[model samples]
Target: ITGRPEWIWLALGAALMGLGALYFLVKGMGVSDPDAKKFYAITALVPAIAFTMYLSMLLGYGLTMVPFGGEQNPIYWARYADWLFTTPLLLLDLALLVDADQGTILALVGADGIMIGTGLVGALTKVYSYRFVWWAISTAAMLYILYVLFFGFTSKAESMRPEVASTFKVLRNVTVVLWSAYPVVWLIGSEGAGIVPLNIETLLFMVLDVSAKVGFGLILLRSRAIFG
Candidate 1:
């Protein structure tokens, strides 16, 4: 049977979510530490929640046209809303990984909120320059998140038990790489930049999301298996 490319992409997303859920649920059952179990459960949750929005967009549901300035801009903002919920869980996992200081973690999460929130505003804005301004704000917030992860979280992770520290370092480096790619994708996707096709933007976003969320979670899960 013939199907849209979106069908294949969404199918992959569903499969990843299922794989993550299975890993978390089964492994979490054996995890003795309450915090570890919670982290894994949240890891499971991120993909599930993200793919629901993905499926909505895939099915042509979750799209809204906003009349901004003069032209109507189509915004699939359910994904933005999903990121708001899921990204924090990702930060929480990192916090647990490095046992980050409370204020530092709080600040990091705050930066994350700013990133997603500004991006949402940017997404809804149809005016090219205005959208660019909002995206600039979002980029600044993303930079702050990276600072906390690199400077704040890195120091703590480095000081952890050798085995844990090694795992944490690997995870931190990968997270930085994947998270760093988001803005690059965003820049291309931005109407103001207009570097790539909208479909290319979607494809890049899906690739990054799967790598950052699912790939990140599995590495984290593997680390837990090592020490737990």
Candidate 2:
């Protein structure tokens, strides 16, 4: 958002999607669940191939931030950071695998995910902390949401036709691949991000992400499908 790209939308898509990988990788470390542990482990099996995977793409985007930053092109890095975090949790949701519960938390991406992820890392668990990263990412998302709520039109249902229509067909594919692999990058300390804090908002967001987006999202989808 602070950066201005000639092709802001395209770069923005890549960066937001990639941001998820970066966010997840860091947030993932504090997750001790056996399934989550294995998930992050196998996610390491990438030779930049993760760039094509949704979870891994976020990692790839973040990894590029350094080089992009090295260029002294703040726009490249800032947009990359935006892309890393603002691709929409629902975009990631479509990438979900089967879940034992009614929903899955992978559904956070874009502004909602950025907020959800940062809020989780900052508020709920014992994940990550870099005073700068947390504050900046959290603040950005909050401001963006306020803009959308006050303004208008900030979402697109992530589907093949709409994605293609928006001049994002190529970008969408690239976005998904990179995002799929984002779950692991920060795990190896490949990037320095993610933070956690002990607060009510953190705990509240954790439940909101699961129950509202992932869990309730599926229910809503099923309801629509059954009725439609």
Candidate 3:
């Protein structure tokens, strides 16, 4: 009788992420090289960390109530906090795949921090104008992140060994497309664009979280077979 969809989605994602993490860990242990092991081990860590964060959010702890226009509503700022941690690891894995230069990778990681950091700050702001301001900064940082991924990261990936580079190309494009939807969800649901109510918003988050975290992680694991 306890079939609230969002919690179901959260539970499913949490479980699957743990599975993905274990899958990578086992593969990593079997792999022979230090760099390859490090890559797989770190890839495992991303979803493992996200699993805990998703479970926490599902349980109703660590969220903040934000006033939107006037009414105070539940805002899952913990998701952003989760992103703040997990995203850099994601980017690191991607950077490793593409052999991105250290300085550029660090800069991109910083950009991701800005994107999530400003986004959460926007959620915390009660004033409409201030909220928009924070959102604007977040959006700008997001754009920069995409630019780095597409142009810089993709370019580097294209120059790698053919098998590995092929995976990088597909991974980058898939990641960019899937990751792009987050801002729309943010605008409509989180920022109160009125396109969807709160309950619907939770499901939207469920779909996106699964796609971004679980789907993305699986894709990376598969890609590692070619390059790892």
Candidate 4:
């Protein structure tokens, strides 16, 4: 295990993201409804951004070395860049699903931005104790996102057709389950406690990202109530 095993994971991640983007685009070609087209485009764009970022990670073009506890930890800023852009679009997909009001959508997106921004700052922070501060702030923002999703969006979706309500529940659950793992990974990975090795951390994140972004797109686009 002398060589970089993470490179393989990075390559696989980039390929999956690239293919996910292409698949969404191809599947969306026949969508005639404006709303469906918008969903399709956003779904496709999420993976497209991920593909580019993952490719950058594979090429070592988006990483920075930051000193932590006398060790130079490699921070993959490209992943944060990916999240900063794609997470909002993912939230928009959910928001539009239940026809959330503009104010709610904006609020959700704003909170999500805070979560990612603070998480990045925390990851790059040199001092371990201060890192927890940013992580707490990011977690607070995430809790707000979950609050809006569970309370606000759930009730609104409940008022919609039964099929729409069910679909929203499924998608929302998927998002919550997958997203909740991110902070845990951050805590244990090199960025936080350094309990997990970098290669394993990379692999874990790749799996989560592919599932969250690519699998989510498939579930949403294939949902009969939403697209059909």
Candidate 5:
């Protein structure tokens, strides 16, 4: 009760993210900087979606619900209790905010939504130069960092199971490679204005990422698929 395993998990994730963010600041574009209004909105959204998905895990991780995108938001929210988890902001939260297993699943799948949503918006708006790198960095550092800092260390003491070994490891590797590349590629732009544009675009994407992915994905994904 006092110090659950989830705490450690969040810590590691926060730590890694803090590190990636530090490196990414000079490398992948610091934070998502849309505007004061947009910036804070986005900052709050990430934890919002995360907790939403976490809720699904607690409800039983059911698949009976249809699995379309944008349109999925209604269904996702309706089944809120079955999903929802501890938002990163809820530093001490551990117990399944809603449903544990389903919430976690929601978190993962929701991330995919984040990817496509954040990528395109940033691109069309010219906010994120090349969509590829920004998203890659977002995934690697932003998302992964949160996971490690918030979830990794906690899982250590929590009721972890042997079954999740492969899944967790693979996810970790994928995120690390993608995020690390953010800085590696960033190294190319080092000599120019330093991190001005990098900062601009990176922050822009972060701001747009939530709106595009979570908000828009909820609306867009509902219909069919907007990728085309």
Candidate 6:
């Protein structure tokens, strides 16, 4: 895989993660409110973790080859590792923004974990039926997350100031819309149906990751409700 075009996408992803971490850290310095500072810290940490994982993947340290479709498909285990850590932090950012209850936060984080865990299992499984079963389970967890976000948290956010409510809506919508793309990509990529080539899949994931992680943090941290 060395010297392959796919590595370019990995390097680009790593670079964005590094930049995002730095941007969040420097921007966070301007935030003096202790409560808002928590958001800064969590947002910064999400990309920082991603930076390490992407770097590992770029250096070919976090990938494994698994047999699928009569071929050796490269499974980037680092992605699942990164998601397991960062997705919860991303959720925490949203939950804290609205001052969500501890139980709700725990539920969201737990469901996110199951989603990533099951997706990883599906990716690694060679048998088509078993793989789809795991994918279905992961999708089910994602649907639960969406339900919680829409039903459980919306009222909590609406009770806040208009600015906070609007910000929460924007952030929540961004998360919901962007996150919905992952499973679609997974289905088309080598891990599922193999309709998409590996390099293309890498590029697709890179775009999605940067948008979801760095882009989400930027929107949350830069909002007037947060920085003001």
Off by more than 4 A, model 2: 1-87, 91-137, 145-202, 225-228
Q: Stretches of candidate 1 above 4 Å error? A: 1-8, 66-72, 190-192, 224-228
Better of 5 and 6 by lDDT: 6
- Candidate 5 lDDT over residue span 120-150, tens digit each: 3322222223434554644453565447424
**What ordering of candidates by lDDT runs from best to worst?**
4, 6, 1, 3, 2, 5
lDDT of each: 0.76, 0.34, 0.75, 0.90, 0.33, 0.88
What is the per-residue lDDT of model 2 for residues 1-228, given as tens digits with 9 covering 90 to 100? 224222333333334334434544664566666644443433322211222332232233322222221221111233233334334433333232212122323323356657546643432223334533664576576466444322221233233234222332232333334433333222221223322221222232223323322233323232212111
Q: Using TM-score as the measure, name the better of candidate 1 and candidate 2.
A: 1
The superposed Cα distance between candidate 5 and the true structure at residue 222, in angstroms, equals: 36
TM-score of each: 0.87, 0.25, 0.89, 0.96, 0.27, 0.96
Report the lDDT tens digits of candidate 3 across residue range 77-114: 77787789888887887888877788988798889999
Model 5 poorest 10 in a row by lDDT: 73-82
Give residue 159's error in model 5 in angstroms: 2.9
Write the number of the candidate with greater TM-score, choosing between 3 and 6: 6
What TM-score, to 2 decimals, does candidate 3 have? 0.89
lDDT of 4 by residue, 1-228 (tens): 226678888999999999999999999987888878888999999999999998888887888888877789988888999999999999999988899999998898899999999999998898878988999899899988988898889999999889889889988999889999999999898888889988899999999999999999998998766653
lDDT by residue (tens digit), candidate 6, 52-166 = 9988988889889888667888888889999999999998988888888999988899999999999999988977768899999999999899888877778898898888899
Off by over 4 Å in 3: 1-5, 224-228
List runs of model 4 lying over 4 Å from the truth: 1-3
lDDT by residue (tens digit), candidate 1, 68-145: 545664566877887898888888888877777788778878889999999988887767778879988898898888
